[PDB]
Point group: D2
Chain length 338, copies 4
């Protein structure tokens, strides 16, 4: 009936992918693996969520399986605690599609370990150095079932930028653009100044600081939108909020446009071919207004500004946790239909 | 030393007094704030959540505010008018830092000679040190404005890059700390609906005229911008996206700023800095070399830090100091 | 259903409306706030940083707020002076006084001049009588009590717990601390709060000691505990949800299991919906939007000995209280 | 001057070095941390989000850490061993080692430092079996001949015990219950994440008030034996980066007004407990004690009394910097014995 899914890494993305799966009812999660969270702890972490509130439904442990229900449907989920993804028995569980959301198996070689356990497809919940990247509504139809078995759903930021960039580029042509994302705190950061050896700024106390950071998210848009390769790059500022982020894209347009024309192009995409991916708003919103929003990108029409018809700053919101999680589920549904 | 009066003993008012004491280039002789009594004034100056305890002694004696750091001692007269007798106090320069007299000439009737508005003014002339302060003309400028914190950050950076490479056009974002105009939880801000939303919970899009204001200090009409208010108590950052006339390497950009930083407001760093590293920094603008990014030699994104409290408050003192000369 | 008016469309005012719409046990027909026009009211009611988007539709039509989940049609006014609000004309029988600035009986009595009959002040009052649902609400007297108080969020949390513990074991004496979320009276950065200096210091940076009469007030709503309770507060940087920390001496010694049972029995019985019991490993955000007055945190409690214990109780200081305001109106309307 | 080595260059490790440089009563000669190489150590010491830029100069030269305040210079050998048994404290000359990793708190684990040539080890935390000391309270019970592995207890215990001593000596504490409202630390998480033994501690720190267990009040009974079994308590972790506060609710033997209690604390603060216990009557908040070197600052006005025999006493502490100064003081003390 529905594609059967395994989740490796029951973290912010892993747990919220499960939440999104239950609400959307387009896939069936049959297994979860996390060596740092036993079944009773899984129940607790799924039940209570500081950002997204109490799970709207019931969750419990029965027979060494996670039982998750929202009244309508019930998911019986096998639970494993293996550190080596090769040891996860996905095949026995019937997990055809595996969400690789631990944050430490992001290459094709490491992610392929899931195939040894009997999985057919793996979706890395992060950018990959070598696995092909996909963004729903932008290049997912370029997916090639016979040759793409290990794929990436890119990053939260790329999923915000790419649908907007695609709309603007299609309509006006982006010669070049520069992106800033003001990004909420994530699990890789620290509560007080601590060790972050590869990235020193990322170790500084998240709650105290505005933190400059490099991201390949804008550059990666050139990978899901080939015509913009080399035409986009960017960076981030990490700020002390628990969730929801915003993209700030400064771009030069080939064909001149008024803000009214820009709004119209976005609304058309939002109301049509990009429904559920790209949304449009004219309200006086702030970040918390998008906690739990399922879209990849919410264009903030009122926050946008133009210097002249060929030079503009475009603003788009995203729930980096829940928006992205909804796209992982959607990406699985798409490739399973292939 | 020029004698200064302060109206509104808030974040800028109090920190202006602090910078004044450290720099010892002015003599504060009076303060007015009708919502703050002299005993309350002692406390607010003494303890500061952001900048720590005042380094020195402060107390009330003889109905006057007594402020000392060992080196100097300032005796400050206190008033509570919402009518301020500035002339009697000898207060030649009045900083209008209530934020609500952006109206300002009322201070001259009390005996003031020059007035510094601690904010942009709709009708008063604007000046920022290091950019247009030498354009001041003593005979005609008696009611003036020292612009905003953000403007003092962008323009010095803008000047160096433009002088060296030429900026055709640019768009600015400032990631900005929480201020007193904001709310602790969702509350009324009738003119600016987003600014009423809980500051500690939110990233808040906000408008700023700072880039436009740079057009007053050849770049008029070539820059505009906006802001995001974020949940930090102080220190903000400028994110300047620009098109260059003459192509440049990042090494070339870093070199122009470093050379300027070591010479003629703006500093250069190549360290792995974050916002708290600039709490108490007195510069108007601090260029973040490693955080800058270029797409190509003619399209770059430039990052500059500023303590929006302490930089500007220091400038309030300096604009006073320059004009007295 | 009782017809209700709301004065002051702030955190409590707006959430009393949310609680009213969800409960459908009262009908809100009018609102007054001179700093928030009808269009702004829609925005403030629609979007909420703490409690999320309104679950329903809200709009302005004909100078009226249209709020539906059932449909409530609400007349809107904008007077600073409560004497000018036509509660009688709009048909507002009970007025929620949630402005924070008319906490005296004389000041609050202005709503009676506009044609309202019964008034519930959303705060402690210096001279108006205070009530806490599940504790002393039956002492309400329709003939003589027309201007009343629903006490404080903190009092609504402590008093029900205090009642259970005192009834069951006897409280000789107790001292309360509430670790309290930031509220609208505080400041984003160090600013003027002339009457209360610590409250002026930047909320996001600080733990702020503050006085509260909430604990003493339990002695007004439970007379036998008068002079036996007091306390204080620490304001901390969270946007909502607070916790009570009650250290008390018991007359009759008790184990914690026995203490737990006394609370659970009450929670499963006469105090259902008022006092709740939990044994989970909860933290503050887990009570965001919780409608209870008090949630006893069984696992966070500690005892030194059977007669000296520390009891922990959570409360959504915004939404728990807002629901009690509604329940109280429904209650006195049942009178 | 006593020569000191530091294991674990974390919040305590680093601020102990800062406090050492400022007090200049010890000489730091070695540091070990396998997750922080020498160049990174420079950065982490130089810049501090909480306590500001290091007041002095810091650099890397010759695989050694060079730390100076103009007057004095500390030349620090740098190591990166995971096993503390492999650290050459003797070769570097580290007689006293601050054990500030958080993962070697038992005596057996702490004893690993002895094999490297260290003589004394100070565990920067409570210990299950190593003896605990609080400066100004029970450090004179230290026994040089037999105590080689010791504990400086916890930050919270260093706040409570000096106040507990003063109130108890003067009025007699029959029994007491403590709450500490505590700043966030490094064991917590930025967003909801795994904390398998302590589920509440895994919940996002910036969003939550978090109940937590602490043995700090009970531990006062070990450094003040007469209060054994007479104190216990718990904690709430709140979203601030530093500075915490003790909330002590106690029953008194001899009835007292708050003014008498204040007077008793004032006397101790200006006399035998100077530099350890401080008294203030100001309208303070937590940030006013950022960087404060005292173990405990009594907040006289925040105190409240129910009756002459039942009171609630409020005391502040910089859990990072107060405790760090005491570590140095304890080294300075035992070295003088
Ligand atoms: N959080 C976001 O906003 C966000 C958005 C989009 C993408 N992502 C990406 O998704 C991935 C997950 O990020 P997150 O925020 O959910 O992180 P997280 O730290 O919340 O989740 C990581 C989880 O993986 C588990 N894990 C660790 N090692 C494991 C192993 N060997 N086997 C199985 N499980 C293991 C951990 O116990 C933890 O529960 C990251 O790569 C991140 O870059 C994150
Ligand atoms: N905070 C910053 O980063 C910053 C930087 C540059 C400029 N500014 C501007 O400077 C101005 C001051 O801002 P602030 O941060 O000190 O705000 P603030 O709230 O800290 O200061 C306001 C003070 O003015 C006093 N006041 C109120 N009404 C008054 C009256 N009728 N007469 C005299 N005094 C009165 C208040 O008692 C209060 O102490 C604002 O216009 C602000 O936009 C702020
Ligand atoms: N927020 C809480 O957690 C909480 C809990 C329990 C009780 N209370 C009490 O309830 C009251 C409401 O607090 P709040 O947090 O909603 O404050 P708030 O700032 O959210 O609400 C204030 C509102 O009252 C309005 N107002 C101001 N003057 C007015 C006038 N003259 N007439 C009508 N309306 C006016 C303002 O426009 C504002 O919208 C407070 O007194 C508070 O002490 C608050
Ligand atoms: N932070 C406070 O407020 C505070 C106060 C008093 C005591 N303490 C105690 O101090 C100790 C350290 O706490 P912290 O807050 O500095 O934590 P932290 O995480 O800031 O410091 C721990 C440091 O130890 C290092 N480390 C980890 N494993 C190691 C190993 N095998 N060998 C050597 N070094 C290793 C880490 O790289 C890290 O830098 C803990 O026991 C804590 O209980 C903390």
């Amino acid at each position: 009936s529905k594609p059967k899914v395994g989740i490796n890494g029951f973290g912010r993305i892993g747990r919220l992918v499960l939440r999104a799966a239950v609400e959307k009812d387009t896939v069936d999660v049959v297994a979860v693996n996390d060596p740092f969270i036993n079944i009773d702890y899984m129940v607790y972490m799924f039940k209570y969520d500081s950002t997204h509130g109490r799970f709207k439904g019931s969750v419990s442990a029965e027979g060494g399986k996670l039982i998750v229900t929202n009244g309508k449907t019930t998911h019986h989920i096998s639970v494993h605690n293996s550190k080596d993804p090769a040891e996860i028995p996905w095949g026995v569980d019937g997990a055809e599609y595996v969400v690789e959301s631990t944050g430490v198996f992001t290459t094709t070689d490491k992610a392929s370990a899931h195939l040894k356990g009997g999985a057919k497809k793996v979706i890395i919940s992060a950018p990959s150095a070598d696995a092909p990247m996909f963004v729903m509504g932008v290049n997912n139809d370029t997916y090639d079932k016979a040759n793409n078995h290990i794929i990436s759903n890119a990053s939260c930021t790329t999923n915000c930028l790419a649908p907007l960039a695609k709309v603007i580029h299609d309509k006006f042509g982006i010669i070049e653009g520069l992106m800033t994302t003001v990004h909420a705190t994530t699990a890789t950061q620290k509560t007080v100044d601590g060790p972050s050896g590869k990235l020193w700024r990322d170790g500084r106390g998240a709650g105290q600081n505005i933190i400059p950071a490099s991201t390949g998210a804008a550059k990666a848009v050139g990978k899901v939108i080939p015509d913009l390769n080399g035409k986009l790059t960017g960076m981030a500022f990490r700020v002390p909020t628990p969730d929801v982020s915003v993209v700030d894209l400064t771009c030069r347009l080939q064909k001149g446009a008024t803000m009214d024309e820009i709004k119209a192009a976005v609304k058309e995409a939002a109301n049509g071919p990009m429904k559920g991916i790209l949304e449009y708003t004219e309200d006086q919103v702030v970040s918390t207004d998008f906690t739990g929003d399922t879209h990849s990108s919410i264009f903030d029409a009122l926050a946008c500004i133009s210097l002249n018809p060929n030079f503009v700053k475009l603003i788009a919101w995203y729930d980096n946790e829940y928006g992205y999680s909804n796209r992982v589920v959607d990406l699985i549904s798409y490739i399973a239909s292939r």
